[PDB]
Amino acid sequence: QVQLRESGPSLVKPSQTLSLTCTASGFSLSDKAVGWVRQAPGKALEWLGSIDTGGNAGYNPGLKSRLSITQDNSKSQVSLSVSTVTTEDSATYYCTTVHQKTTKQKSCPEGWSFADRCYYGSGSCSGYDCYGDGDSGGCGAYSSYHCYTCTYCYEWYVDAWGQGLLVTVSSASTTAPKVYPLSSCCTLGCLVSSYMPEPVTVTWNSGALKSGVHTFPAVLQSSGLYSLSSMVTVPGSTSGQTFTCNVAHPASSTKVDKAVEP
Amino acid sequence: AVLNQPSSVSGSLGQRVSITCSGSSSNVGNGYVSWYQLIPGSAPRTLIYGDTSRASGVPDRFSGSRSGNTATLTISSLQAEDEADYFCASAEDSSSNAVFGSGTTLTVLGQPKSPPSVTLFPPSTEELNGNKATLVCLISDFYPGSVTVVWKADGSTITRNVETTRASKQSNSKYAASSYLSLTSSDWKSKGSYSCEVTHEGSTVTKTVKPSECS
C-alpha cells in the first residue's frame, strides 16, 4: 500500500504562487504516475496534472498555463505549482497515484461509414487489441469481424488518494467579525460577517439559550473573508422575550452582543 | 467541462440504487469510466475503473456499466456504510487529461422524508447603514440532507457572489443549510424583489423579500 502525504502552506496570498509537495513511499509507486486533484468546497473534483516515472508531465488544458509539476526522485517527492492564485483556487488538494495508458483497440466510430457492419462497439476502449491505425480496410457489403477501426483507447483512473490539504487564498489579515441581526420582513438569527481566520464562538443569552440553536459552518466568500450564521427556533409559541446573541472572535480578542427583535 | 450526475440519490436498506453519469464521445464515449466514493473525514476511495472493473477491497454490491455517452454505477444491496458522495471520471481525449462528474450524494433512508423550511432574511438596517447588504437564506428541517439553491432577482437567476454551505445535521437529526447573496446597499435598493429557491427531492420551496415593502 502506497502512502501519500501532502505538505505546504495552508494560507497563500492572492497573485502569489501556490506551492505544494507530496511525499510518496511504497514499492508500487514505480508502476503508476503521481498526480494532483483538487476540490473546492461544495464543488466537483478537478483534475490538475500528473508526472510519470520518466519525468513526463501532462496537465489540464484549461489550467496548464498556470501549472507546473516536478518530482524529486531522491526524496521521493512530487511538487505542484499554481501561479497567480485567486480566491477561486481555495480548495483541498489531493496527491494521488494515477494509472495512465494509451492503447490501440478495435472499435466502430460513429461517423465511420462502415460502423453498421462492425462488431466491436462504438467505445474506443473495447478490450480487443489491434495494431496499425484507422480503418482496417476489410469492410465489405456484409458485416464481418475483419471490419473495424484501430483507435486510441485512453485508460485513466486514480489508484490511491492522499488525505488532502486544504489551502485558502486570501489577502486579508485577522479581521474582527461584524454581527448583524436576522429578522423576517413582514425563527431568528445572527449573521457573523467578514472575519478571519476562524473560528468564532456563538452563544445566545450568555448561555441561557442553547437548545433549539443551530450555528452553521462558515463560508469563504469572494472577499477572502469568512461568514457564518446562527439560528434560533422558538418553541411553545411564547411571545415577548428578547433574544441576544454573543459572538466572540479569538484572533481579534473581540466579544460582541446583538439584540434581535421584529 | 464536467460530467453530469444527479445531485442526490436515496434508497432503503437492502434496495438497489443507480447513479448515472452522462458526458460526450470524447470522455465517456471513450469507454473507460471510473467511480469514486467520498466520505467526510476520510480519503477518497476508488471503487470502479475501466467501466466494469472493481478495485481491490471493493464489495460485490458495487458494479458499473456504460451505454454510449452515459455510464451508471449500481449498488445492488445498500448498507449503512454506503452513505457518501459518489463521483464518476473519465479521460478527456488523452491519457493525461481527465474530467470528473458533478457528484451525487447517496443517503440510506433512516427516517421519513421531510421538506425544507426556508426563511429568507433581508439585510439589517445596521448593515445597510454601512452601505452593504447580505441576504441570508436559512434552510432547515429537511431529510434527506441534500438541497440545491437558486437565487433570483426580479425573476432572473443570479450566481455572482453566492455562497452555500453543505447540509449539516441538526440536533433533531434532520439537516440544515445556509446560502448567502452578497450585495451593495445600492444593488439591494435597485431591485424590486429577491427570491431564494430551495429544491429538495424534486420539490421547490421559494421565499421572496421586497426591498420596498420590507422596512
Residue numbers in the entry:
A (entry chain A): 1 to 186, 195 to 270
B (entry chain B): 2 to 9, 11 to 217
Describing publication, verbatim:
Under these genetic constraints, cattle have developed a unique mechanism to accomplish antibody diversity by forming the broadest distribution of CDRH3 lengths and the most frequent occurrence of cysteine residues in CDRH3 loops. Consistent with the five structures solved previously, the 7 new CDRH3 structures also showed a long “stalk” formed by 2 anti-parallel β-strands supporting a compact, globular “knob”, further establishing the stalk-knob configuration as the general structural peculiarity for the ultralong bovine CDRH3s. Each of the knob structures starts with the conserved sequence motif [CP(D/E/A)G(Y/W)], in which the initial cysteine residue forms the first disulfide bond with another cysteine residue in the knob, and the motif forms a type I β turn. The compact globular folds of the knobs are maintained primarily by several disulfide bonds, a feature that is similar to the core of other small disulfide rich proteins or domains such as voltage-gated sodium channel antagonist mu-conopeptide, CnIIIC.
The exception, the knob of antibody BOV-7, will be discussed separately below. Interestingly, the antibody BOV-7 knob has very different structural features from the other knobs. This knob consists of five loops separated by 4 disulfide bridges without any α-helical or β-strand secondary structure elements, and four of the five loops are more than 6 residues long. Two of the four disulfide bonds are formed between cysteine residues in the knob region and cysteine residues in the stalk, resulting in three loops that are partially buried in the stalk. Therefore, the antibody BOV-7 knob, being structurally intertwined with the stalk, shows distinct structural features different from any other bovine CDRH3 knob described. In addition, the knob structures varied greatly, even when the same disulfide configuration was used because of sequence and loop length differences. Remarkably, one of the new structures shows that disulfide bonds can be formed between the knob and the stalk, and the knob structure of this antibody deviates from the common features of the other mAbs discussed above. In addition, the knob structure of one ultralong CDRH3 BOV-7 shows a novel fold different from others, suggesting that bovine CDRH3 repertoire might construct additional knob patterns to what has been recognized so far.
